[PDB]
Ligand SMILES: *C/C=C(C)/C=C/C=C(C)/C=C/C1=C(C)CCCC1(C)C
């Protein structure tokens with residue numbers, strides 16, 4: 001194809017697909033209902049990302065949004081991916097540390113606003129307002145990172161050290177990889193246009209694989225997922 | 230801006246935003262998992278309404294729908310608000326009186342049809358059919374009001390009198406404020422066009438703040454939310 | 459109306475509506491919370507299908523999708539129906555055999571991809587790619603049929619014989635009726651265009667009523683829904 005960013009969309013599609021199959025093959029056999037949950041959730045993440053990467057690759061997940069007096073290529077399928085994948089990732093973390101339903105409700109609701117305010121920001125036709133929507137989404141992200149640090153973390157330690165330690169690593173990964181997303185949006189095609197879409201697509205591809213597949217490897221190789229007791 | 234209804238969209242945006250912050254500040258500290266749930270649910274309601282009011286205010290949540298041979302301004306973002314907020318409000322009520330999963334399923338499903346049939350009605354291009362969709366949505370609303378009165382109410386009394394009494398007030402508020410919505414739609418911009426959008430926007434703004442913020446004040450100041458036992 | 463397929467859309471609308479009322483009237487009185495769940499779920503199925511059939515009948519749920527250098531009539535409202543009804547049908551089956559949350563999560567997620575990949579396939583503008591999306595959706599369907607056969611079936615027998623036997627019948631019905639859907643899509647208006655939309659609409663109408671109403675009659679007349687113990 002003629003879009004310069006095809007190679008990264010193709011790469012991203014292959015790695016999500018490859019990682020979906022691996023978690024599928026590893027998953028079969030497992031009879032533990034606790035482990036059964038983590039495998040379901042964590043395998044669905046790249047299975048979804050795979051379909052959205054494919055839709056971007058084939059060109060379905062792309063509309064042109066006019067702003068700054070020019071048609072801009074906006075991959076809307078990213079947000080449809082994130083709207084479903086980011087909540088499932090948070091659910092993986094909350095089941096580990098055995099969060100109560102209240103905390104889960106807030107995280108998931110806040111996540112919904114983050115991605116939703118992101119999408120509206122991405123399709124807003126007044127340039128200034130795009131940044132208003134980014135700020136609100138970013139404000140929701142910080143709330144989520146606050147809950148991951150101060151809503152549970154002390155209660156995550158008052159339990160199995162395999163759950164506590166495995167949570168500590170996955171939390172640190174989540175914070176570092178998720179924080180990058182707003183910065184890339186801000187300087188990429190959707191915000192200031194400082195970085196061209198080509199390289200922005202590379203950056204999201206690296207972030208998405210690490211945040212989904214990299215994340216899943218750490219979790220599915222740990223012994224926190226099993227109950228044993 | 231040049232839209233006459235801006236002042237009410239701006240007002241509504243400020244009050245939802247102001248009410249979101251208040252429930253947030255009041256919320257922090259609370260350690261009771263039952264209370265934790267009611268706070269999560271009831272704070273998310275205006276947080277969502279805030280973003281949709283903002284989108285209306287900035288002009289994103291507005292399309293023109295042609296019917297009666299004229300372009301009509303239709304704020305579609307109301308329905309995206311209600312689709313999420315109205316179920317969470319019903320969930321607040323069902324957790325109080327400890328409804329079973331079956332009853333919750335019906336209420337939420339019925340709510341989905343109500344708002345969905347509402348949206349389709351709002352974007353239908355044949356004037357007569359709009360009223361067909363209104364009737365079906367209104368038929369779903371009555372079903373919901375029947376369940377609130379006769380599916381639980383006797384079982385809501387066979388429990389803590391703080392839960393029973395606090396439910397009685399919130400139920401009466403819900404019935405009176407929710408019943409108005411179909412009437413306003415019917416006579417406003419979306420139906421008969423007897424009341425102009427300007428004043429219709431005022432009416433929904435007053436209804437929405439009372440049904441969301443007013444509602445939340447009553448609930449969050451009560452001692453039904455806490456378990457204690 | 460001038461659309462040849464109106465008679466089947468009208469028929470389908472009447473039978474869904476008629477079946478919704480019947481399950482409603484039969485439903486009232488029932489006080490058993492287990493039975494309460496199955497009635498909620500199984501009554502919502504045709505209540506939803508009714509509204510989507512109506513939207514198709516009135517002409518709201520229809521867009522023209524250009525491919526093969528011609529505008530093609532595509533009833534998008536089928537997918538909005540299935541996106542909600544097919545998960546609720548699977549939930550009826552999983553509550554019978556008392557599946558764990560993990561298995562339910564996978565089935566529902568897989569179902570989401572099936573219908574989602576179906577919709578994208580239905581609105582893809584490159585003819586070849588439509589079949590790529592069909593293959594992925596069909597691959598998700600087979601996964602679901604595998605879980606219905608080999609993820610539970612042995613555990614469905616290790617319990618009440620009324621639950622085991624009633625599950626056996628409903629499973630066999632599900633497999634036979636669901637497998638037809640991809641074949642009809644493939645040869646109908648959305649795929650190869652071997653069968654005209656007129657007769658395709660007939661075929662989906664017969665499948666939908668049997669898969670929803672026929673299905674519901676078998677389930678709601680059984681004694682598996684009640685707990686008794
Ligand atoms: C699987 C992909 C993941 C984990 C994606 C995460 C994406 C975010 C955390 C995005 C955040 C954004 C903001 C907070 C600012 C507005 C723009 C967004 C949506 C990129």
Ligand SMILES: *C/C=C(C)/C=C/C=C(C)/C=C/C1=C(C)CCCC1(C)C
Nearest residue numbers: 347363366367370407410411414440
């Ligand atoms: C937070 C806002 C609330 C509580 C909104 C409630 C809205 C309704 C109960 C709307 C009902 C409608 C009908 C039953 C008739 C069709 C038009 C609607 C959607 C306004």
Ligand SMILES: *C/C=C(C)/C=C/C=C(C)/C=C/C1=C(C)CCCC1(C)C
Nearest residue numbers: 576592595596599636639640643669
């Ligand atoms: C109430 C209606 C029901 C049970 C509909 C079921 C529909 C399917 C199982 C559709 C399956 C499809 C594929 C697996 C291939 C792609 C096209 C679809 C969506 C028709």
